[PDB]
C-alpha cells in the first residue's frame, strides 16, 4: 500500500514541545500516535 502511517504536527501540536515534555510521556504518546497509525486527529480541528 501507501501512506499507512501519518503522524502529523498541526497548528496545535509541534515536535519541539514533544521533545521538551517528559520523555516518558513522549514515548507513550508516540506509541499512541503510531499504533493508531495516523494519530486519528491530533489538534482535533
Amino acid at each position: 500500500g501507501h501512506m499507512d502511517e501519518k503522524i502529523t504536527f498541526p497548528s496545535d501540536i509541534d515536535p519541539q514541545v514533544f521533545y521538551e515534555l517528559a520523555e516518558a510521556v513522549q514515548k507513550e504518546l508516540l506509541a499512541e500516535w503510531k499504533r493508531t497509525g495516523s494519530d486519528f486527529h491530533i489538534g482535533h480541528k
Binding site: 497548528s11 496545535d12 501540536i13 509541534d14 514541545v17 510521556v25 500516535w33 493508531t36 494519530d39
Partner: protein, 76 residues
C-alpha cells in the same frame, strides 16, 4: 490566579483559574481557547497526566505555572 498552558505547538494559552479549579473545568477553559472537548484533552503537568476529578492544588499547581495540552487519542 493565572496559568500558562503551553500547547504541544508551543502556543502558551494563559488562563485564569484558582488552585481549587478542577481539571474538568480547566479543560473546559482550554476548549474555550483551543476548541478541543475536555473529554478529549490529556492534560499534562511536569510529566504528570492530570485527571478531570482533581484540582490544580491536588497537583500543587499554583499561580503563574505552566501546563501542557496533549491529546487523549480517545483510545477507549
Amino acid at each position: 490566579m493565572q496559568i500558562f498552558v503551553k500547547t504541544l505547538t508551543g502556543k502558551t494559552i494563559t488562563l485564569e483559574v484558582e488552585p481549587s479549579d478542577t481539571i474538568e473545568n480547566v479543560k473546559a477553559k482550554i476548549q474555550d481557547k483551543e476548541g478541543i472537548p475536555p473529554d478529549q484533552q490529556r492534560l499534562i503537568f511536569a510529566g504528570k497526566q492530570l485527571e478531570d476529578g482533581r484540582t490544580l492544588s491536588d497537583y500543587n499547581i499554583q499561580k503563574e505555572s505552566t501546563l501542557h495540552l496533549v491529546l487523549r487519542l480517545r483510545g477507549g
